[PDB]
Design a protein around this ligand. Sequence first.
Ligand SMILES: *[C]([O])C1(*)(*)N(*)(*)[C@](*)(*)C(*)(*)C2(*)(*)(*)=C(*)(*)C(*)(*)=C(*)(*)C(*)(*)=C12(*)(*)*
Length: 150
Amino acid sequence: NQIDLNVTCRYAGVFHVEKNGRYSISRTEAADLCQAFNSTLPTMDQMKLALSKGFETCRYGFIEGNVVIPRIHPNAICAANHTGVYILVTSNTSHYDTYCFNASAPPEEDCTSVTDLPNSFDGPVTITIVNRDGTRYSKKGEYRTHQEDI
Ligand SMILES: *[C]([O])C1(*)(*)N(*)(*)[C@](*)(*)C(*)(*)C2(*)(*)(*)=C(*)(*)C(*)(*)=C(*)(*)C(*)(*)=C12(*)(*)*
């Protein structure tokens, strides 16, 4: 009973979370996950500011209202060579990664590790935060509030 949460640097408070290294988060689980990080789904405006500070990924993830990929450099295998906040238009499927926004983060790039999940609740799951540099923080708990996600 274990969940890995792979987390990125924050840019103007915005970061990317991948559950178990594969697209596997529903829209409801995404909201609950950000809440566990004392964060919210970013607005489009928040994501555009993050992009302007250096944020890019090669992964679809939820923001408030849409599924997006922030792109700085054009890459053929990431968002079909687009730059800017690329918006997913057509998909059959419902599960992606998520973005989250923490207002208390530094205003620009913060590439320090994440070492807590401050708003997780009591539960039986071993939840491990995995940073890109390999640094890990684990705790026993839960964050999912919708039965359909568990
Ligand atoms: C990157 O960015 C992503 N994917 C792969 C794996 C991992 C880990 C940690 C953090 C992040 C990530």
